[PDB]
C-alpha cells in the first residue's frame, strides 16, 4: 500500500552502490544479471517491485527478508523513505531483483 513517491532516491542509490549490490552479487555466487519477466518504469515503481520481490513470499520462493542484501535493503528504506518503518526458483527471483536495481540506478538527465 505504501507509495515510494516521497523517498530519497539519490541516497538509496548511494546505499546500493556501497552495500546492497555487494550482498546481492555474493548471494548470486558472484554473478550479475544480464531474460526479464519483471520490469519497472520509474524510481517509485522500481522500489514497489523491489519491495515485493525482496520481502513478500511468492509461489516459488520463500521470503528473502532474512538474507543479508534484504536486511540492507530494509535499512535503506527505513532511513530514506518517510513513514516506511537457495533454490533455482529463488535465484531467478533475485536475478530479477538485480535487474530492477540496475534500472533504479540509471543516470538522471
Amino acid at each position, epitope marked *: 500500500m505504501y507509495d515510494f513517491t516521497n523517498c530519497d532516491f539519490e541516497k538509496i542509490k548511494a546505499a546500493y552502490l556501497s552495500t546492497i549490490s555487494k550482498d546481492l552479487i555474493t548471494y548470486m555466487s558472484g554473478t550479475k544479471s544480464t531474460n*526479464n519477466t519483471v*520490469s*519497472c*518504469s520509474n524510481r517509485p515503481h522500481c522500489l514497489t517491485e523491489i519491495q515485493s520481490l525482496t520481502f513478500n513470499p511468492t509461489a516459488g520462493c520463500a521470503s528473502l527478508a532474512k538474507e543479508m542484501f534484504a536486511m540492507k535493503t530494509k535499512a535503506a528504506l527505513a532511513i530514506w523513505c518517510p513513514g516506511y518503518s537457495t533454490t533455482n526458483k529463488c535465484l531467478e527471483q533475485v536475478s530479477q531483483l538485480q535487474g530492477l536495481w540496475r*534500472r533504479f540506478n540509471r543516470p538522471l538527465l
Partner: antibody
Amino acid sequence: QMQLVESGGGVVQPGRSLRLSCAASGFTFRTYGMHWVRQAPGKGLEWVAVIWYDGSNKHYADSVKGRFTITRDNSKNTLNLQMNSLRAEDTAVYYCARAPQWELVHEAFDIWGQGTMVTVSS
Amino acid sequence: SYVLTQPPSVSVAPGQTARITCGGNNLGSKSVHWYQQKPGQAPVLVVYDDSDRPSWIPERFSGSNSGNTATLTISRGEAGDEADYYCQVWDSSSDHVVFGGGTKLTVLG
C-alpha cells in the same frame, strides 16, 4: 515461456467495428508498456497505439486517433484494441508487443505476438 | 514527425558482411533498435539501445549509432539471415514510435 497471443481478427465492412485481444503469459504484465503495431500487406511496420504499464496514459498515432481505443486489464493480463469506423487503409496484420518504459521513454519491443489479420472490405 | 530512412534493399554474398544503414536527424542522440522479420513471421528484436544484443541473438549481429547514421552489421552472412530489417526509435519531441521503411536483406543465390 514468455508469450503474447492475439485474436479478434477477421473481415468487416467499412464503417463497422472490431475488437482485438492480446493475452500475455510468462511475465509480469503490469510492469510493461503495451503497444499495437500494424503492417499492411507488402508494406512496413506502423506503430498504432500504446498504453502505460498502469493504464494511466494512452497515446495513439494520428492515423487512428479518435477511432481506436487501447485498454488493458492488469488482473487478467489482457490487452485490447477497440477499432471503430474502420476504413480500407486499416487493412493490415495487427501485432501486439511489450516494451519496458523508463520515465517518458519507450524501449525496445522484445516480445511480439503472432499477429492477427484484419480486413476492411465490402 | 521524425523520419528514419533506410535503403529499400541490400544484397550480400554468402560469408560476406552485410551493412544496413538507418538515417535520421541527430540520430546519435536517440536509442536505435533493430528488428528482423522473416516472411510470414512476426518481427524479432535483434539489437536494442544502439549496440546491445538479446540472449537469443548470434554474435554475428552488431549495431552502432553515430552522427546521423545507425548501422546494423551482420558478419559472415548466412542464408538464414535473409529477412526484412527495420530500425526504430522513440521520438521524444513528437512522442511517437517511429519505424524505418525497412530493408530487405538478400543473400545472393
